[PDB]
């Protein structure tokens, strides 16, 4: 129905909540049997957010192979993502074991450790370079190499070492610090400036494993990031950009993990982000520099 024409119609009618509730009704429902198992109670942050059995990530160990994580595999767009929860004090070792085993090169964090006076994610990475972290359970070592702090986001350079095999790898950490829980980013230009920084780094490249994207539960703010990125990839290789349906792409994504995108305003933002980002795909190179100035990263 073409996205820009569809946007103006819904904004004039004021039916954003109705369009969103229709997506919840049509969404897939698959079993989460392993996640509900009694022994895995302390491996889940929220009892209402669980991964499906068919798309869950398995750890390479005989004891317990569980972690609250899912593989989103987008066939036509040719890109994969791993969406997980913000780790608990006891699952920090499992988190980094997954990164090693799945051969990921980048971690996208869209939340903060403490939001609204409550702990939403453990401090899984070191803040000071002289204070490295050692995860005794999985035999892994983590050290901070450098950091580049901007006004609303931070890019970190980390070194992950497998102590059993003596191998070393560089992991890039992209932390968005000003995205509130159940909220939206400040502007479409600030979101896109961040997305393209992750794209130019080489983390989303097929020579590496799937990028790890998380928040507190890893469904709300993660859904908005992944929907915008996939929609932009689809209009680049289809050669008929007007045929990309946002609502249909979100329904394909929810076949792999429950509740992607939590509010009606998060859905409205995804439209604004894709429409603005379509200008770069159309051949206008100058809009990338206009996003950097409108974001005010100083």
């Amino acid at each position: 129905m073409e996205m820009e024409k569809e946007f103006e119609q819904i904004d004039k009618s004021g039916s954003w909540a109705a369009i969103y509730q229709d997506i919840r009704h049509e969404a897939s429902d698959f079993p989460c049997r392993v996640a509900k198992l009694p022994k895995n109670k302390n491996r889940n942050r929220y009892r209402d957010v669980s991964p499906f059995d068919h798309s869950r990530i398995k750890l390479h160990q005989e004891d317990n192979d569980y972690i609250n994580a899912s593989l989103i595999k987008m066939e036509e767009a040719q890109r994969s993502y791993i969406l997980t929860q913000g780790p608990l004090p006891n699952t920090c070792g499992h988190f980094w074991e997954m990164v090693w085993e799945q051969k990921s090169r980048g971690v996208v964090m869209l939340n903060r450790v403490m939001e609204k006076g409550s702990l939403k994610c453990a401090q899984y990475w070191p803040q000071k370079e002289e204070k490295e972290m050692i995860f005794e359970d999985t035999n892994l070592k983590l050290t901070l190499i450098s950091e580049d702090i901007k006004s609303y986001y931070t890019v970190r350079q980390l070194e992950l070492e497998n102590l059993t095999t003596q191998e070393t790898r560089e992991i890039l950490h992209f932390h968005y610090t000003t995205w509130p829980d159940f909220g939206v980013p400040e502007s479409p230009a600030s979101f896109l400036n961040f997305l393209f920084k992750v794209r130019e780094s080489g983390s989303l490249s097929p020579e590496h494993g799937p990028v790890v994207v998380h928040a507190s539960a890893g469904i709300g703010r993660s859904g908005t990031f992944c929907l915008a990125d996939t929609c932009l990839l689809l209009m680049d290789k289809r050669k008929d950009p007007s045929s990309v349906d946002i609502k249909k792409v979100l329904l394909e994504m929810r076949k792999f993990r429950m509740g992607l995108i939590q509010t009606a305003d998060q859905l409205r933002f995804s439209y604004l982000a894709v429409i603005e980002g379509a200008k770069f795909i159309m051949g206008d190179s100058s809009v990338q520099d206009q996003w950097k100035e409108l974001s005010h990263e100083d």
Binding site: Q21, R45, F182
Partner: peptide, 7 residues
């Protein structure tokens, strides 16, 4: 503790 918004 819960997260999900089921309106």
């Amino acid at each position: 503790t819960d997260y999900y918004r089921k309106g």
